[PDB]
Amino acid sequence: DDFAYLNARVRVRRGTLLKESFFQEALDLSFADFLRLLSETVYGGELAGQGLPDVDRAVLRTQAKLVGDLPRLVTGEAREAVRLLLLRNDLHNLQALLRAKATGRPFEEVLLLPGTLREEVWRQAYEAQDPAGMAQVLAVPGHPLARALRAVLRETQDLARVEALLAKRFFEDVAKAAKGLDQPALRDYLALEVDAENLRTAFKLQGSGLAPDAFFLKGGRFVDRVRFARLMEGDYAVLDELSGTPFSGLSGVRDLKALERGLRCVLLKEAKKGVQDPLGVGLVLAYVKEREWEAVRLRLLARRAYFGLPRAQVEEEVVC
């Protein structure tokens, strides 16, 4: 098993993470100067073309070899712990894959990177012609996200529903396993991920007339059914009573964009102070949030530069 070698491999990698002062420089640059800067970094090391499709691809391929190769390098008890983190990036691939089989559209225009399910699992799944067979091919790597899929697929074959019940059931699955793999660092974070999900499920489905109890799943810290119901009526006075959590910063805010920005920045923060717990999954935890967030800012800074958008429209979203 064991994170002893694996943590060590990641510590060398934390050396080539992009510090805050790069994005600071990049805003001052035009697209031509941005491109010269980008090539110094490790995302730059996969670059294959000046234009936009190529920037999206260099970023993605950097994430595929430095982050998406982690579950293979461990096994067992190590592997389950690392796997839960990786699983969110796999769910994104799965939801798109499930949707290409079902609505008959090509394999293309989806997210592919390795994680827990390999590239070949997604190709064999795609080519499967019965949803049940599609499901056994997915169940081969082993993970809680299969077991979550399997139960939802028994109730339904409707696209929109499978998507929602899979996500709900999946975070519930994740939580139980994670609580049983211990460590304070992971527990604090898990709580925030669920709390953030809860808020966020409420925002995405806002005003659809639905049940507010459906947007609250266990794992919480301070949020409950009533806050959800008020929130659903359109009242944001609930967020103004929400303190003692690091979402203290959501108070007095009522725009969906500022609210959701806020949750992603909070989750970033928890993970960045998990490096005072680098033992076990703590360090990897911090490493994945930072590679993800970094990749996102280079894509936003590249878009902002190419189309000559307003600076303040993106300067605020590239810092927490």
């Binding site: 304070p184 527990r187 604090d188 709580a191 810290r221 301070f222 003692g244 959590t245």
Partner: protein
């Protein structure tokens, strides 16, 4: 025994070997327990200040075990 002179007992020496076990293991165990609640307490303040009280009530509980152990050692050895 006493530090003063007022005890003697061939039987008692054997009682000391056997009793050293019970105190030592109870302090080991109580400590390991204590730590989990204390790390948990870090989380409790983080989650909500007002229910620092919750960390406090659980945290009292492993203490009972060492304390109980100290009294058992005195009765079996050192009472006289």
């Amino acid at each position: 025994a006493e530090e003063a002179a007022a005890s003697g007992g061939l039987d008692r020496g054997l009682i000391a070997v056997g009793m050293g076990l019970a105190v030592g293991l109870a302090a080991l165990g109580t400590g390991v327990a204590q730590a989990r609640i204390g790390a948990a307490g870090v989380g409790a303040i983080a989650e909500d200040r007002s229910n620092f009280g919750t960390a406090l009530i659980f945290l009292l509980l492993p203490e009972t075990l060492v304390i109980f152990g100290l009294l058992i050692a005195f009765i079996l050895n050192g009472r006289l």
